[PDB]
């Protein structure tokens, strides 16, 4: 409930009291102590996690007033405090107890601590100075015990709970690089640190924008009047307290270009912001793109100046959403609200921001509106998602005045007149993040040091938009293409716009166009595009015409198609290029960003025109690190999950692990991952019972569920694109398996930094080829190596899919190795079956498609590209002589490696027993003879039938038993009883008694399937292969 | 495995999915198939002879897709292939891939 809050100075921890009205309602005999939770209406879009509190009764506190130790957030008491807060008691004494806590201590205090003789004395020392009482003090994560000298690093498992000196595990650390020096309370210094200065000069201060909309409730002054939030600005109690009063009616902010006005309020205690600065909403920042602040000043302006104006002009300000036809009805309607719902103060030549949203259009509010004023309710349902500017261009003062400025408008008399379109460059992002203020679906923000392509594109546009137009500018034309889709080039272009304030005209071909009628005319597309550009390009400059999925309109000349279609193709291609040139030459500042799903398909007639096309590779782990931190950011999760309590991770996740473990080939839509994580977390939360023995305060994501989600995502992506998994049990990381392992390790290491520092510049990188009899280790080795030392195992798995009738096989293999280069630490396993055809290079299957395939494969197999490339090639063949050394030549697949021989000690009866253990085994099967009845050189692969056929034999015996049973009963009860009916009715839990014994196994072995390859084949290939490998 | 399904339902660990017959001509194995087709009561799909192939480009792939789709969508059945060589020769081919893509 609503509660007034105050701050005391009673030790670092103390059960601070509350008013008796609240206390007596819950501090009854059912508990010896009162516990609850406190809630501060802090700034920001959502809200922070709440904090536990311990209370005792007190009669000195007035109606519904609460006290807390001012330090608990770490600021001075003199600072303006809460007007109100939320409090709620913990019912049924359900107070959690923490399992472990971590502490960070300084050198002197830590030494003094451990120098104590015994554990009990150390616990008492912890107890005394910190006033922490066991089973009665609730502590939280990241709590600073004392300013700049010690801190509690974290708590587990819960964010907040009680501490037991003999059950809660206390961990202490000191380290050496002195984090603690910077870990001081927020009140780093006293209020009087800043020297006093009188009413001398302007003393203006820098200008910065708010992070979010400011709620009306937290205001310390009385918002008595219906001022429409129009000019409020905030400061951190400095540069204003020096003045006579902090509640000035009006403040001028500047008159560098032309004058503007603001109102100032002191920022309240727990804020987080840059020190000693002014904060204003976007409407104020609009007038000051250059961050001039020249003369902020206060004067006795009074309550009113120029209370009336007539025929106030308003005008359009260009841009895509302003000009589009669909929205005009609602958007003009909404203007009448903005200008009529409440009082506001305008300036000459000023900008008003107004929100227009979510296609909430053709949804007429009502047939009539004369009878009531009820617009405010709708806002509870209209969450905004887009903004347009309107420009007043003027002031229409009719009387005499000092200057035609700083004038009030009156809803009763101040009628409005619209006029034709005007241009004005929007704000750049680094000047003010417009989106966050209005809670829009915020576009991504890159750091320009880590992403190459955005830096390139943005600089190329930046040099053009204004840097060069002062002279004469080369018309800009840039095309974005990527080997893979969803890679965020629309986000690139939108970010470019937001960073440079350049208007963006996003013409997405799919939705905007109406093509594929394949009528006898292309004039529709031409007129549509040209008209829409024409409507907006004048008075919107600089502009970015962005054609998305351009390849739907412009595409290659498939001259094998029927005539009278290709003629439309020519028509459209040429005419489009005509519009290209027309825009570039007729208008100043056209740039035409394009995006294409695959570059080749753009016809040559059009490809040449553009310059410096950008390849947009999929993000590497260094980028992934920043995009996980973006999606998992503080209030991206919270944005629309309107549930009772916000969401966060707050601890324990390791972005390097997430980035490395399997985020390779998750090129974008990590949103899927993070949303699945949110899902698991929220489900685990809501399923909690009301009593449950415990209650979770907020949703917390854990790294285990995130790993689960990434595995799930990779599995569900597997259907879309083939992706190996780890379905292996009890057969992994056998470092000592064989002598071969050392060579594997000593050849896999050199091209990698962490095993071998050398860059392998001149040194030849090579793959690994295994050779020998099939069925004895060629696959498990690969998975083992990949998952233990390498990271990715995106094997070919499809070489047999050689080619279509089109000669695309070369492109196919190129794409295979491009997928290889994606998720750079990847090892490609070659099945080595049919795409490795050439025995002699000139005699097999005419040397056709496959000969080109093999030529390309050997050409690209290792071009000494780069160590950082990470592409390793592993394969498994019966014979290296199976090939003509085209791709087996030294330098590629070199360091040929032998599979080895198991016959010395086959170490597989154990594996047989372990596998069969899942099946009934305790029937004398365990003994050795079952394996020893066959020569010790027995094939390993045969066991996986030996077991199966044995089981089948068992099932046969039991089956003949029941075949007896049924007959018997048919003789006893009736011959007409169906077998299925009988076996259903007389069914028993003992049906699973699938009798199995040694004799079953021996019968199965001697009956059928001697082996896959046992007689002589294996032996002589083994010996010959070992001999020729020297 | 249909007659004694509670015996066969449990223990999915190991199994064999199909069987291959071959022998001298006239040794009843077609008649074995026929009898197994009719007395067993299990559904039986008779793709006798290399009817799988089709004139148009890569129609064989789609044909096999349809065949297996019908097999799955019909309740448990036997896909009967005879003169298997006619539909699955060795890997090597000088001709188009329309005769080996099928394999
Ligand atoms: N760097 C990024 N950070 C966060 N989200 C991103 C990023 N890149 C892409 N996205 C996500 O993907 C979207 C951008 O790609 P989108 O699918 O809209 O178009 P596109 O990249 O042109 O793709 P396609 O060509 O396949 O249609 C964003 O709206 C966001 O949801
Ligand atoms: N159990 C049996 N043993 C021997 N002959 C049988 C048996 N059952 C039926 N026959 C008769 O002998 C023939 C067995 O050979 P059949 O014609 O079925 O061979 P097939 O499997 O079609 O041979 P292929 O494809 O090599 O020509 C049957 O067509 C039938 O006339
Ligand atoms: N020395 C070994 N190294 C790795 N796996 C082995 C070994 N011996 C037996 N195995 C097991 O049996 C299989 C050995 O042959 P495998 O690598 O599968 O070749 P193939 O694919 O020709 O059957 C492995 O999959 C593994 O499960
Ligand atoms: Mg796109
Ligand atoms: Mg026959």
Swiss-Prot record, chain A:
Changing residue 805 to A: Cells are unable to grow on a medium with oleate as a sole carbon source. Residues 478-683 are annotated as: AAA-cassette D1. GO terms for cellular component: ATPase complex; cytosol; peroxisomal membrane; peroxisome; transporter complex. ATP binds at residues 772-779. Residues 767-956 are annotated as: AAA-cassette D2. One of its GO terms (biological process) is protein import into peroxisome matrix. Changing residue 831 to Q: In PEX6pB2; increased amount of peroxisome-bound PEX6. Results in accumulation of PEX5 on peroxisomal membranes. Its EC number is 3.6.4.-. Changing residue 528 to A: Cells are able to grow on a medium with oleate as a sole carbon source. The keyword S-adenosyl-L-methionine does not apply. Component of the PEX1-PEX6 AAA ATPase complex, a protein dislocase complex that mediates the ATP-dependent extraction of the PEX5 receptor from peroxisomal membranes, an essential step for PEX5 recycling. Specifically recognizes PEX5 monoubiquitinated at 'Cys-6', and pulls it out of the peroxisome lumen through the PEX2-PEX10-PEX12 retrotranslocation channel. Extraction by the PEX1-PEX6 AAA ATPase complex is accompanied by unfolding of the TPR repeats and release of bound cargo from PEX5. PANTHER family: AAA-FAMILY ATPASE, PEROXISOMAL ATPASE PEX6. Interacts with PEX1; forming the PEX1-PEX6 AAA ATPase complex, which is composed of a heterohexamer formed by a trimer of PEX1-PEX6 dimers. Interacts with PEX15; anchors PEX1-PEX6 heterooligomers to the peroxisomal membrane and mediates their association with the peroxisomal importomer. Interacts with UBP15. This is Peroxisomal ATPase PEX6. The gene is PEX6.
Swiss-Prot record, chain B:
Changing residue 82 to Q: In PEX1pB2; results in accumulation of PEX5 on peroxisomal membranes. Induction: By oleate. ATP binds at residues 23-30. AAA-cassette D1 is required for interaction with PEX6. ATP-binding in AAA-cassette D2 is required for interaction with PEX6. ATP-binding and hydrolysis in AAA-cassette D2 is required for proper function in PEX5 dislocation. Present with 2100 molecules/cell in log phase SD medium. Belongs to the AAA ATPase family. Interacts with PEX6; forming the PEX1-PEX6 AAA ATPase complex, which is composed of a heterohexamer formed by a trimer of PEX1-PEX6 dimers. The PEX1-PEX6 heterooligomers associate with the peroxisomal importomer via interaction of PEX6 with the peroxisomal membrane anchor PEX15. This is Peroxisomal ATPase PEX1. The gene is PEX1. The chain holds residues 716 to 818 of 1043 of the full protein.
